[PDB]
Design a protein around this nucleic acid. Structure first.
Ligand code: CL
Ligand code: CL
Ligand code: CL
Ligand code: CL
Ligand code: CL
Ligand code: CL
Ligand code: CL
Ligand code: CL
Ligand code: MG
Ligand code: MG
Ligand code: MG
Ligand code: MG
Ligand code: MG
Ligand code: MG
Ligand code: MG
Ligand code: MG
Ligand code: MG
Ligand code: MG
Ligand code: MG
Ligand code: MG
Ligand code: MG
Ligand code: MG
Ligand code: MG
Ligand code: MG
Ligand code: MG
Ligand code: MG
Ligand code: MG
Ligand code: MG
Ligand code: MG
Ligand code: MG
Ligand code: MG
Ligand code: MG
Ligand code: MG
Ligand code: MG
Ligand code: MG
Ligand code: MG
Ligand code: MG
Ligand code: MG
Ligand code: MG
Ligand code: MG
Ligand code: MG
Ligand code: MG
Ligand code: MG
Ligand code: MG
Ligand code: MG
Ligand code: MG
Ligand code: MG
Ligand code: MG
Ligand code: MG
Ligand code: MG
Ligand code: MG
Ligand code: MG
Ligand code: MG
Ligand code: MG
Ligand code: MG
Ligand code: MG
Ligand code: MG
Ligand code: MG
Ligand code: ZN
Lengths: 101, 119, 149, 207, 50, 87
RNA sequence: UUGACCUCAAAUCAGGUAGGAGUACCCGCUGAACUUAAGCAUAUCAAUAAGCGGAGGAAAAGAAACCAACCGGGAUUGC
RNA sequence: AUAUUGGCGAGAGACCGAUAGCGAACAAGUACAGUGAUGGAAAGAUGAAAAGAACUUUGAAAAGAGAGUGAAAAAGUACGUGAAAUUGUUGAAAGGGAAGGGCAUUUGAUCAGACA
RNA sequence: GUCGAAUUUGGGUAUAGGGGCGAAAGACUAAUCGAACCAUCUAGUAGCUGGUUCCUGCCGAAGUUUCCCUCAGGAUAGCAG
RNA sequence: CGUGGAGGUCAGUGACGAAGCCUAGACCGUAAGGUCGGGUCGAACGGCCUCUAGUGCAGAUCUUGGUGGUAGUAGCAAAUAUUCAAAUGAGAACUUUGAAGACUGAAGUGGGGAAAGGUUCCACGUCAACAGCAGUUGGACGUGGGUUAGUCGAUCCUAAGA
RNA sequence: AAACUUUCAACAACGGAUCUCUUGGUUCUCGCAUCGAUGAAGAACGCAGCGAAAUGCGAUACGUAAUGUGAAUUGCAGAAUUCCGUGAAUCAUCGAAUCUUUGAACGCACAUUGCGCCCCUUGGUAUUCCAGGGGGCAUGCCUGUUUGAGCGUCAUUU
């Protein structure tokens, strides 16, 4: 016989993911000194649709501890999170929806 | 017609450069006339004269450089012997004839003798 | 494929044998080349005899041990008994073989006699270079043949 | 050539196309396309059983039987009837075999060699060779075999002191040492009765 | 096409100059057996394959 | 529809001219020549293709430099210039 | 501080060198099947074709950890 | 000392003689075909010398008919020799749904031999 | 038949032969597909079909026995020169 | 018996015509074949004794090339349609000009381009072949002329991807 | 009886067999050892008074220089002084040069005649912008030179 359908998918020619319209990989912040000892406050800028993903995404901006600029993080939005909300992430963050602990 | 190489060699580079310019000017006007005459075979000898002048000028310049590099162990690659690639990489006569002190003692002590079967 | 009363034959021609056929069309040509090469070598080596002196040895094996033939070279002991060194013997036209040994007195004595007769029948030109012109003898085997004892 | 007729990629079309099953050149657009190939009956094909270099060319002959033929040829030279029947003009020659003086071996010039041969009765045989030159009758003319002529006398000597060079340019005349007689010369075309002029020294050495 | 690279245009220029009859004076030379240009090309019969 | 009507849709070249060998064999998308193997350092050649070797082997071109090697060897790769003799 | 050593880098540093072609013959690697066996799998075709790497005018081999069992022979190559 | 269907320089043949011999005796790995890898032809001969036909005449012209050149236009750049299939003209003969053949003789045409 | 959509289509780009691609017909992969095309191994093997080139003279058959994965083939004895 | 080539011989034949070819002309042989005359032709060729082989064709849906009957036959019938006169020319149903009758009917038989082609564009000269009739005409043949950019494109950027 | 059909001959067609010819092929033998980063083999484009191809050559372009020979080349035209001579020739030989764009191909790229950097010089009222000319800038590795890195590590000062 010939190579069956499920075997052909591993070659990844026409079976790759369609990622043109993706907003980006959804990840938390990199575990750093502020996260493991205290907390750092971020601001939700917008909640946007992501192609190929049912759940919406949230854009949260944090300040860079070690140099003067802003850092952009892409989170998966929980129910109740709204634009303009402050997000607290770290070991000493409060127990509220949207906080990372 | 045409110039003579042996006559050009007895002239300085300033005279040769001026003569080249005159030949180039003559070539330009002949090409203009070629557009009217049915044929113009005279243009051949002018082109060959320019080639002869360029040959002699190049001979003088290359000869002058050879005097600058005379004796020195490094010369430009265009002034070195061509031969072949393999011949230029082979050991020189001095390198190929080298022997150890042990071997030269044997060669002097016991060389191939000359003998005959007579008596 | 098998018929009649005929011998069983074994002709090994089941490979691509036609690609490896060698016909000696140059048998006559190579004979001329060898003769030309021998002539030009004799002229190159002065009056030297074109071949080295060889000893007489016993052929091995029970089948061929009744005969004597020519060996590669004289042993170190045979050369020493003749009254000269191995290094000088090589430069004078005598073959020396270091791996052959002497265990038979008859063979040892005969090879000693061959070396002595050879030395008395040759002339060694001095290193000065005067070089008197002597006739070249092209063979030392014919001059010193080997006879069955 | 071993590659002749096989420098193609031709393949048979098979049956069903109303043509013979011979292999045919592929492709198109040249006129050569579709033509037969590889066959001994095909134009531009391979010949049947191509000739090979390992065909036997030389033949072994027993040495003693070879000497038997040579001895018979020598004895045939002494028979006048056989010599005449082979085409030699020896009608008015006094005695066969003809033996001449040994000084013939020392002749240096062609002019005096020819005069000596004519003086012993070989003049008519020499004229036969000159007047028999003809152009060859086939394709051998442009294969370096353009002219043919008859064979003249054979002069046998014991020592060569100039006789070989003196007769070299004479048409149809060849010399031979008595010690190395050639059957190809004694019986040309396998016909016995060669006209042989013996030198006295060579005649004695036959014993 | 109207849009063409320099290489294509240079190739076409040479093919135009090679498509001409043989001069008559060449046919009278000693030992001349050339009669017509065997490499003549017409734009509608044989394509350049470019 | 796979014959004559399909032949009318052929207006995009798979191959273009090769810079090295000059044939119309440079595959556009694969960026490689199917005839000489450019841009690979070696020129592609195969022992099963005896005729293909013959079409491009040494001696089929001009041999601008290799022409004169035999003459130079015959004169022992001499250097200098010919001296002026009489007449 | 200063000066060595070791190891590892840089330079359009001074001077060189390698690539590609050819490949009949030469030194290696890799490696089939048609075919034969009246079938066929071991076998055979064959340590072959195709594929890959490397030389020269020749290459390779070569002065015995050899052959022998003889009264011993004596580097290698070829017939 | 051995090998050598490559390269360069030579000498040869009971080899082939233009459908043969290398695919190629010629502007041949050319013309041409294929997107491509690749595939791959046909094609040699006037005469010693163009001396390659001035001139006249018919025709719009190609050409024709004369003249002329040559040993020969029964050699005219469709050119040495010029076979067969097939075709035209002329001459002879036969023929009521084939033609052709064998034996024998009539008729017509044609022909050798001996006139000892 | 369908005709605003699982619509139609240009150009760019990706997947290559026991592989690809398939809303699945063993369909399609350059008029080639129940395994493309090109060259070589390769003049692959064939108990099977076809063909196998001058004259005259003399002699002149067999389709039967035994064995064979033997039954369109061989060996063997016979018949023939 | 015949064919290509080889050794020997007939001091063989031949430009005063060798070989080849044509010839309901003659002779020899049971036959394979051999010999002669006539015509054509132009440079080499044969008898005999032997040697040698790529040595003899009616066939193979044989190979290559050439040629028939069929046969002046099938046919040259889609896309509505042509007509009169003059000019040119050896020659006009088809070229040019004028006049008339018609069609495409703006998703055109109109006016520009992308691919692809490559001089087919334009003028003069010109009809052997090509335009499945014709031809004085032509995208044919011969000889020449013609493509002008700071602003239009390429060039630069990145897309799937390489 | 003609036409027509068939057979034979002569002359004429069609076609290119046969015969003769051969600057080609094929096989055997002998001798020799010489490609390339000093840019090869191969490819593209050009070069002649009148050339498309083949052959030759590279903007010095069917060639330049040098040596030999000693009067041509030839289809036509032209040049003639090149003819008792540093000299004719599409001659031979060949040791000096030229050698476009490429190609192992080497500043980076290449379906582009696309885009940079450095040195010297010239011009535009200019070290910085623009343009012309000349000369440069690939990779792996070896030896050496120079400038450096590391508490890998030694000695010596405070
Ligand atoms: Cl599937
Ligand atoms: Cl054979
Ligand atoms: Cl003759
Ligand atoms: Cl265009
Ligand atoms: Cl050839
Ligand atoms: Cl193809
Ligand atoms: Cl592929
Ligand atoms: Cl008969
Ligand atoms: Mg057929
Ligand atoms: Mg056929
Ligand atoms: Mg052949
Ligand atoms: Mg014997
Ligand atoms: Mg004949
Ligand atoms: Mg045209
Ligand atoms: Mg077209
Ligand atoms: Mg298909
Ligand atoms: Mg399409
Ligand atoms: Mg594509
Ligand atoms: Mg290969
Ligand atoms: Mg440097
Ligand atoms: Mg090996
Ligand atoms: Mg089997
Ligand atoms: Mg079988
Ligand atoms: Mg089987
Ligand atoms: Mg191999
Ligand atoms: Mg070499
Ligand atoms: Mg050797
Ligand atoms: Mg070695
Ligand atoms: Mg040892
Ligand atoms: Mg040994
Ligand atoms: Mg041929
Ligand atoms: Mg003639
Ligand atoms: Mg005649
Ligand atoms: Mg004729
Ligand atoms: Mg006929
Ligand atoms: Mg669609
Ligand atoms: Mg089914
Ligand atoms: Mg067969
Ligand atoms: Mg087959
Ligand atoms: Mg009977
Ligand atoms: Mg049957
Ligand atoms: Mg005659
Ligand atoms: Mg007849
Ligand atoms: Mg003649
Ligand atoms: Mg035959
Ligand atoms: Mg026939
Ligand atoms: Mg038959
Ligand atoms: Mg047939
Ligand atoms: Mg009709
Ligand atoms: Mg009709
Ligand atoms: Mg119809
Ligand atoms: Mg109509
Ligand atoms: Mg309508
Ligand atoms: Mg209307
Ligand atoms: Mg027009
Ligand atoms: Mg018509
Ligand atoms: Mg017409
Ligand atoms: Mg034209
Ligand atoms: Zn290429």
């Amino acid at each position: 016989g010939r190579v069956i359908r499920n075997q052909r998918k591993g070659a990844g020619s026409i079976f790759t993911s369609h990622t043109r319209l993706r907003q980006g990989a959804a990840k938390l912040r990199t575990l750093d000194y502020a996260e493991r000892h205290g907390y750092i406050r971020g601001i939700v800028k917008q909640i946007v649709h992501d192609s190929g993903r049912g759940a919406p995404l949230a854009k949260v901006v944090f300040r860079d501890p070690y140099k003067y600029r802003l850092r952009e993080e892409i989170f998966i939005a929980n129910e109740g999170v709204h634009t303009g909300q402050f997000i607290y992430a770290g070991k000493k963050a409060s127990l509220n929806v949207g906080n990372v602990l | 017609a045409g110039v003579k190489a042996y006559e050009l060699r007895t002239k300085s580079k300033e005279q040769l450069a001026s003569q080249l310019v005159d030949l180039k000017k003559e070539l330009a006007e002949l090409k203009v006339q070629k557009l009217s005459r049915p044929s113009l075979p005279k243009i051949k000898t002018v082109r060959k004269s320019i080639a002869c002048v360029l040959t002699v000028i190049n001979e003088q310049q290359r000869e002058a450089v050879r005097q600058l590099y005379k004796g020195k162990k490094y010369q430009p690659k265009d002034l070195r012997a061509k031969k072949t690639r393999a011949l230029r990489r082979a050991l020189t006569k001095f390198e190929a004839s080298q022997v150890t002190e042990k071997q030269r003692k044997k060669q002097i002590a016991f060389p191939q003798r000359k003998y005959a079967i007579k008596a | 494929a098998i018929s009649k009363n005929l011998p069983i034959l074994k002709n090994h021609f089941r490979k691509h044998w036609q690609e490896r056929v060698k016909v000696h069309f140059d048998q006559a040509g190579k004979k001329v080349s060898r003769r030309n090469a021998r002539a030009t070598r004799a002229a190159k080596i002065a009056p030297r005899p074109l071949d080295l002196l060889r000893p007489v040895v016993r052929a091995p094996t029970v089948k061929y041990n009744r005969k004597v033939r020519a060996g590669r070279g004289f042993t170190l002991a045979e050369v020493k008994a003749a009254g000269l060194t191995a290094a000088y013997a090589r430069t004078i036209g005598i073959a020396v073989d270091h791996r052959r040994q002497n265990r038979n007195q008859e063979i040892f004595d005969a090879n000693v006699q061959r070396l002595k007769e050879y030395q008395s029948k040759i002339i060694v030109f001095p290193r000065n270079g005067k070089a008197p012109e002597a006739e070249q003898v092209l063979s030392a085997a014919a001059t010193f043949p080997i006879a069955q004892p | 050539s071993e590659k002749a007729g096989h420098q193609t990629s031709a393949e048979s079309w098979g049956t069903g196309r109303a043509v013979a099953r011979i292999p045919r050149v592929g492709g198109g657009g040249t006129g050569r396309s579709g033509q037969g190939a590889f066959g001994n009956m095909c134009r531009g094909g391979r010949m049947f059983a191509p000739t090979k270099t390992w065909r036997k060319w030389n033949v072994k002959v027993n040495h003693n039987e070879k000497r038997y033929a040579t001895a018979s040829a020598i004895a045939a030279t002494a028979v006048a009837s056989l010599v005449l029947a082979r085409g030699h003009r020896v009608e008015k020659i006094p005695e066969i075999p003809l033996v001449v003086s040994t000084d013939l071996e020392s002749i240096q010039k062609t002019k005096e060699a020819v005069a000596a041969l004519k003086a012993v009765g070989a003049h008519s045989d020499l004229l036969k060779v000159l007047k028999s030159k003809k152009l060859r009758a086939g394709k051998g003319k442009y294969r370096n075999r353009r002219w043919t002529q008859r064979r003249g006398p054979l002069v046998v000597y014991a020592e060569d002191n100039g006789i070989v060079k003196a007769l070299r340019n004479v048409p149809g005349v060849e010399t031979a040492n008595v010690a190395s007689l050639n059957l190809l010369q004694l019986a040309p075309g396998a016909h016995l009765g060669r006209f042989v002029i013996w030198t006295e020294a060579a005649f004695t050495k036959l014993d | 096409a109207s849009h063409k690279t320099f290489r294509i245009k240079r190739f076409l220029a040479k093919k135009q100059k090679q498509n001409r009859p043989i001069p008559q004076w060449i046919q009278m030379k000693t030992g001349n057996k050339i009669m017509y240009n065997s490499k003549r090309r017409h734009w509608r019969r044989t394509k350049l394959g470019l | 529809g796979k014959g004559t009507p399909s032949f009318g849709k052929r207006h995009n070249k798979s191959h273009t001219l090769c810079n090295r060998c000059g044939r119309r064999s440079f595959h556009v998308q694969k960026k490689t020549c199917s005839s000489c193997g450019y841009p690979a350092a070696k020129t592609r050649s195969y022992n099963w293709g005896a005729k293909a070797k013959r079409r491009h082997t040494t001696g089929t071109g001009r041999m601008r430099y290799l022409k004169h090697v035999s003459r130079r060897f015959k004169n022992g790769f001499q250097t200098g210039s010919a001296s002026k003799a009489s007449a």
